[PDB]
Design an enzyme around this catalytic site. Structure first.
Site, PDB file in Angstrom:
ATOM      1  N   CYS A 128       4.017  15.174   3.765  1.00 17.24           N
ATOM      2  CA  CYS A 128       3.636  14.828   4.634  1.00 17.24           C
ATOM      3  C   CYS A 128       1.588  14.965   4.107  1.00 17.24           C
ATOM      4  O   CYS A 128       0.910  14.157   4.886  1.00 17.24           O
ATOM      5  CB  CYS A 128       3.392  15.097   6.304  1.00 17.24           C
ATOM      6  SG  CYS A 128       4.304  14.246   6.870  1.00 17.24           S
ATOM      7  N   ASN A 130       5.549   8.340  11.511  1.00 19.79           N
ATOM      8  CA  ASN A 130       4.942   9.478  10.464  1.00 19.79           C
ATOM      9  C   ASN A 130       6.284   9.190   9.428  1.00 19.79           C
ATOM     10  O   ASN A 130       7.422   9.232   9.271  1.00 19.79           O
ATOM     11  CB  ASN A 130       5.634  10.460  11.127  1.00 19.79           C
ATOM     12  CG  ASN A 130       5.197  11.762  10.085  1.00 19.79           C
ATOM     13  OD1 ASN A 130       4.816  11.320   9.102  1.00 19.79           O
ATOM     14  ND2 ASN A 130       4.708  13.125  10.181  1.00 19.79           N
TER      15      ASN A 130
END
Ligand SMILES: CC(=O)CC(=O)SCCNC(=O)CCNC(=O)[C@H](O)C(C)(C)COP(=O)(O)OP(=O)(O)OC[C@H]1O[C@@H](n2cnc3c(N)ncnc32)[C@H](O)[C@@H]1OP(=O)(O)O
Ligand SMILES: CC(=O)CC(=O)SCCNC(=O)CCNC(=O)[C@H](O)C(C)(C)COP(=O)(O)OP(=O)(O)OC[C@H]1O[C@@H](n2cnc3c(N)ncnc32)[C@H](O)[C@@H]1OP(=O)(O)O
Lengths: 375, 376
Positions: free
Chosen positions: B150, B322
């Site tokens: 991420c 996400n």
């Protein structure tokens, strides 16, 4: 100025197996003594590798504790990862300490880190593990290169060249660290390329410090990185495919890999050296990834090299096996150590410019030109 | 000059699943209906995410054909890899075509390719597949970033900036492509963080063209890449750990992750913006990796941002979930597209400087400063 290599350090796992003993060791530990003809073939393969010995992190005890690693395509990735996820960064730290000690400057001055391997993956990665191991700045910029394979000794040099040259004052630590336990497999009659692979590779890690603008009273240039090329060889996609599956890293290795390198190698040499006005291949020094002995031989034939041009490359292959991404960086170290030991005028066998080649899946060739340092 | 972002393209898999239906879908396809209380808790988590829908390359048919993907920790890596090894590069090619079409210059002029993912690995890698798929130069210089996570939408920008700025005339194609099939898992009582993770992530790819010295007659600057920083947050190592095992990509995600970001974010902002003489956080535009809705809330609260500063970040979280390493790059496109649709004076919401944050294992924070470009 040019990104320059200022220090090199190497490390290997402590356990060494002689190539002359490897077939017996391997047929025994995999419980495959009933495959007598395949053992004979593997004895032939080992004899042809021109490898004297190899250091391996994989021990007999680990194999006994994780039998599944010896059974062709049984689930064994978790056991492999359990070894290499801590193994790889720990071996890389050992090489990196040596590089940092040779370089002699505070470790606090390392601004970038490139960690490269072909054995396992994890999150945080081996790069994070290395910074914690070495105590590097928590703000060091990191480049985590996973599943990179045999051209990636060229890749790390290509990357470090741009980081060092674009960032004034920067000092880049390169670590390649390879543990072949991820691709160890027991013998299987239908997968001779996989068998061949069991004789080729050894374990090792190399670490380099690279920077532009060397402070010559206290830093010692070994080689400058002049230019880097990367190219995909046409119609060689089948040459090498390796998939990370439940049974470990699998192998698809075409027998004509050497000839696929022979067909393309003069064009990579010419592309790198023509811009420098160099057309005589024997006027420069060569560091050639020893994917196998036959690859070296084809390069020497197609470039019409004198018989000793590839000594340093063959010497690394003999004493350590094919070290995947770290291999060519062990050869850079060999070239400069041998040159100093022989009293040459330069770190590159007394010559001014050299060419390094990495070969990996795609087929990819990485071609790096290095300039020697006058001594 | 500074590395500049010149074009952006995105793509997602076709299958879309509403978050309001995800709990029922998930417990049905993983045959876990008897876990009523876990089902109830998964409905609460999905409601908390502030995600409206996600696009997923993983299908129900694929799950029925590969049932061990739904059995917590049964061997399923090979099924996963058989999906994502072709899917990631193909999905990245769809995003790349769009970026290159916007750009409009010949694809033969792309000199460097950065391919980044967190889903699967193979040799030759996804970078090689992408070159073949798009018809880039065989000699394009490649940077294959696997198992990145991420924070790696900040990573690719950090790397492209140095490659563009050190190589005169170079044009870098960045592709981040994430398929979350590699981390799908059925529900299990003893792994509640792994259950939370089934609600957070969606699939997508973003592609960018980056270069220094833009030929202004034909290339259109969107944002310049001013500075980049990467730093490990102290004492947060156990916050996020993900292992690639026989059962797929595992999860260990600590409940205090949002507060760990909050404890350290003001410092990240200051180190990036102090050298620029900026101290007012509401005077800059912000692109915040939406690791979960609580991360956005903490960053907003700790920096005391006004009410709509994180709109664009909340907007892609809502519409896509996400998207791991591609997530911040979808936010950059959302900012410039919304800014031009509203008639703002610059591509960064009418403001001059902006800060992008990525958050990943380590804990690591990547902080990238972008300079916007004047619209008109
Ligand atoms: C991880 C990475 O990124 C990817 C990597 O794997 S790249 C690996 C690259 N290295 C190699 O591909 C090149 C290896 N090739 C060589 O160096 C040489 O062929 C060698 C040392 C392997 C053998 O030396 P040689 O001079 O060719 O001997 P040769 O007798 O022809 O061959 C050895 C035996 O292996 C066989 N063999 C060689 N390569 C083979 C292959 N890839 N698959 C099947 N069998 C093959 C021969 O067929 C022969 O067997 P028999 O005695 O049973 O007749
Ligand atoms: C791939 C990689 O690179 C690594 C990555 O995975 S990075 C992923 C980063 N993302 C995150 O960490 C998620 C951040 N958390 C979130 O944004 C929010 O916690 C959320 C949307 C999940 C829920 O919002 P919230 O306001 O915090 O709600 P809250 O009621 O406290 O919690 C949701 C339910 O999940 C639980 N939960 C939340 N996070 C938890 C975790 N990490 N572990 C265990 N359970 C957790 C709570 O305990 C709660 O349950 P009950 O209703 O059963 O009481």
């Amino acid at each position: 100025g040019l990104a320059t290599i200022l220090a090199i350090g190497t490390a290997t796992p402590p356990n060494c197996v002689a190539q002359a003993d490897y077939a017996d060791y391997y047929f025994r530990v995999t419980k495959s003594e009933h495959m007598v003809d395949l053992k004979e073939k593997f004895k032939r393969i080992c004899e042809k590798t021109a490898i004297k010995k190899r250091y391996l992190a994989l021990t007999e005890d680990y194999l006994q504790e994780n039998p599944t690693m010896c059974e062709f395509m049984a689930p064994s990735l978790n056991a492999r990862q359990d070894l290499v996820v801590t193994g790889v960064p720990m071996l890389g730290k050992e090489a990196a300490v040596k590089a940092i000690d040779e370089w002699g400057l505070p470790k606090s001055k390392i601004t970038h880190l490139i960690f490269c391997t072909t054995a396992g993956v994890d999150m945080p990665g081996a790069d994070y593990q290395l910074v914690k191991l070495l105590g590097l700045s928590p703000s060091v910029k990191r480049y985590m290169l996973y599943q990179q394979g045999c051209a990636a000794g060229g890749t790390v040099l290509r990357l470090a060249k741009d980081l060092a040259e674009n960032n004034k004052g920067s000092r880049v630590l390169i670590v390649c660290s390879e543990i072949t336990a991820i691709l160890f497999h027991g013998p299987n009659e239908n997968h001779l390329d996989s068998l061949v692979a069991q004789a080729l590779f050894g374990d090792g890690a190399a670490a380099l410090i690279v920077g532009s603008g060397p402070h010559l009273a206290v830093e010692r240039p070994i080689f400058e990185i002049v230019s880097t090329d990367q190219t995909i060889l046409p119609d060689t996609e089948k040459a090498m495919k390796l998939h990370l599956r439940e049974g470990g890293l699998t192998f698809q290795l075409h027998r004509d890999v050497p000839l696929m390198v022979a067909k393309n190698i003069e064009n990579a040499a010419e592309k790198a050296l023509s811009p420098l006005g160099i057309t005589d291949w024997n006027s420069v020094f060569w560091m050639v990834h020893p994917g196998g002995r036959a690859i070296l031989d084809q390069v020497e034939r197609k470039l019409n090299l004198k018989e000793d041009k590839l000594r340093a490359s063959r010497h690394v292959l003999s004493e350590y096996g094919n070290l995947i991404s770290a291999c060519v960086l062990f050869i850079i170290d060999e070239v400069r150590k041998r040159s100093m030991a022989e009293g040459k005028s330069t770190t590159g066998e007394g010559l001014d410019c050299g060419v390094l080649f990495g070969f990996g899946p795609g087929m990819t060739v990485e071609t790096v030109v290095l300039r020697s340092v006058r001594v």
